[PDB]
UniProtKB/Swiss-Prot annotation:
Record-given protein name: Host translation inhibitor nsp1
Residues covered by the CoV Nsp1 globular domain: 2-113
Coiled coil: none
Function: Inhibits host translation by associating with the open head conformation of the 40S subunit. The C-terminus binds to and obstructs ribosomal mRNA entry tunnel. Thereby inhibits antiviral response triggered by innate immunity or interferons. The nsp1-40S ribosome complex further induces an endonucleolytic cleavage near the 5'UTR of host mRNAs, targeting them for degradation. This inhibits the integrated stress response (ISR) in the infected cell by preventing EIF2S1/eIF2-alpha phosphorylation upstream of stress granule formation and depletes host G3BP1.
Start and end residues of each stretch annotated as Disordered: 1-113
Annotated organism of origin: Severe acute respiratory syndrome coronavirus 2 (2019-nCoV)
UniProt subcellular location: Host cytoplasm
Length: 113
């Protein structure tokens, strides 16, 4: 399927144990996609002071369309030293590995895979 319905656990930035997916734009997009497939991917909502507490490169989910079955259609955009790889809509949050942190909420997304 070109899209997969996912429910992403929303994590508080200060709880996050593994603060990024790796060391290159290509690696973080790769790793983010693998963790999304394996159900081991969390979401941190972006506000003032969040991104400097996480590791670059960043992987964002961005709204790709204006929402089947409650699931917002999203795609992945990476960012490194202020350059983005991908072009999409509004940021829903920054993806991180999920290693058992307790979430505050779930974000239903339809991921372009």
């Amino acid at each position: 399927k070109t899209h997969v319905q996912l429910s992403l656990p929303v994590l508080q930035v200060r709880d996050v144990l593994v603060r990024g997916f790796g060391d290159s734009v290509e690696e973080v997009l790769s790793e983010a996609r693998q963790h999304l497939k394996d159900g081991t991917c969390g979401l941190v909502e972006v506000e003032k002071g969040v991104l400097p507490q996480l590791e670059q490169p960043y992987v964002f989910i961005k709204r790709s369309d204006a929402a089947p079955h409650g699931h917002v259609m999203v795609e992945l955009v990476a960012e490194l030293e202020g350059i983005q790889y991908g072009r999409s809509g509004e940021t829903l949050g920054v993806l991180v590995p999920h290693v058992g942190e307790i979430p505050v909420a779930y974000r239903k997304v339809l991921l372009r895979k």
